[PDB]
């Protein structure tokens, strides 16, 4: 059913092709401050490369 | 039809040249607050040498 927020994609790995998933999520509660304004920092995981 | 804020660009790569873009956009909303007095920062990207 792939619950909110998660995307299928396909990746040509090097040996065939694999239905990789891809995956995200909040990290805090978001109302910290009605007025609050501070970039929403993305935090990237998984053994990237640069 | 080159949408807003791209521009062609020349470049002597290693092996010819190629007409490669460059590209910009906005990352937040503007009117964070209307009186708002903040450098408006940039953020440079795309492996850049110093």
Same mark, same amino acid.
């Given at each position: 059913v792939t619950p909110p927020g998660v995307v299928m994609g396909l990746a040509w790995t090097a040996m065939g092709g694999s239905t990789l998933f891809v995956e995200t999520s909040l990290r805090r509660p978001q %109302? &910290? %401050?009605? &007025?609050? %304004? &501070? %970039? /929403?920092?993305?935090?990237?995981? /998984?053994?990237l490369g640069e």
């Open positions: %109302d &910290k %401050d009605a &007025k609050g %304004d &501070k %970039d /929403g920092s993305l935090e990237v995981t /998984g053994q």
